[PDB]
Enzyme design. Structure first.
Site, mmCIF file in Angstrom:
data_model
loop_
_atom_site.group_PDB
_atom_site.id
_atom_site.type_symbol
_atom_site.label_atom_id
_atom_site.label_comp_id
_atom_site.label_asym_id
_atom_site.label_seq_id
_atom_site.Cartn_x
_atom_site.Cartn_y
_atom_site.Cartn_z
ATOM 1 C CD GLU A 35 -3.132 -0.652 0.281
ATOM 2 O OE1 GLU A 35 -3.126 0.349 -0.517
ATOM 3 O OE2 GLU A 35 -4.008 -1.711 0.004
ATOM 4 C CG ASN A 46 -9.055 6.378 -4.057
ATOM 5 O OD1 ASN A 46 -9.406 6.626 -2.915
ATOM 6 N ND2 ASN A 46 -8.167 5.686 -4.400
ATOM 7 C CG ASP A 48 -14.333 7.810 -5.037
ATOM 8 O OD1 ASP A 48 -13.150 8.330 -4.699
ATOM 9 O OD2 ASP A 48 -14.906 7.019 -4.377
ATOM 10 C CB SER A 50 -12.127 9.077 -1.983
ATOM 11 O OG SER A 50 -11.923 7.972 -2.602
ATOM 12 C CG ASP A 52 -6.650 5.651 -1.226
ATOM 13 O OD1 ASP A 52 -7.990 5.695 -1.053
ATOM 14 O OD2 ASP A 52 -6.211 5.607 -2.402
ATOM 15 C CG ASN A 59 -11.562 4.832 1.580
ATOM 16 O OD1 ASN A 59 -12.516 5.504 1.734
ATOM 17 N ND2 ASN A 59 -11.620 3.672 1.756
ATOM 18 C CG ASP A 101 -15.804 -3.298 7.195
ATOM 19 O OD1 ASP A 101 -15.685 -4.439 6.673
ATOM 20 O OD2 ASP A 101 -15.702 -2.389 6.437
#
Ligand SMILES: [Cl-]
Ligand SMILES: [Cl-]
Ligand SMILES: [Cl-]
Ligand code: NA
Ligand code: NA
Length: 129
Positions: A35, A46, A48, A50, A52, A59, A101
């Site tokens: 990462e 990203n 969209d 957003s 990270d 994110n 989650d």
């Protein structure tokens, strides 16, 4: 900060990540390598809109607030800049929420594509823990 491999493993171990939700320490080290290359100051946009952040590339669409991701959540209740600190506490505490989650470590695309199903213990081999 750019961590060494065993330095990061030890920090993660002390913060309780070793076998957290059944993921052995090598999984977390492997995810961090791919990462962020072990760099706490890593950032990546990203498609969209957003972003990270940090060693585990958490994110802003769901987990932190950066003030520029419209319609996003802040489920870790932290500014995204906190995830870039040389102290990994905030990144680790937020990662514990993410991995719990429902999807486990599959939330990290690089873990699924580069670590899952490999010999992840190699990432901690030789380290004094
Ligand atoms: Cl495991
Ligand atoms: Cl730390
Ligand atoms: Cl799981
Ligand atoms: Na391991
Ligand atoms: Na957000």
């Amino acid at each position: 900060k750019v961590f060494g491999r065993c330095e990061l493993a030890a920090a993660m171990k002390r913060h309780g990540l070793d076998n957290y939700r059944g993921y052995s320490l090598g999984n977390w080290v492997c995810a961090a390598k791919f990462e962020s290359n072990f760099n706490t100051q890593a950032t990546n946009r990203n498609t969209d809109g957003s972003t990270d952040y940090g060693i585990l590339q958490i994110n802003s669409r769901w987990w932190c607030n950066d003030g520029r991701t419209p319609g996003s959540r802040n489920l870790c209740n932290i500014p995204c800049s906190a995830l870039l600190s040389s102290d990994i506490t905030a990144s680790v505490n937020c990662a514990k929420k993410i991995v719990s989650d429902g999807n486990g470590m599959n939330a990290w695309v690089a873990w699924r594509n580069r670590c899952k199903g490999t010999d992840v213990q190699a990432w901690i081999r030789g380290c004094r823990l």
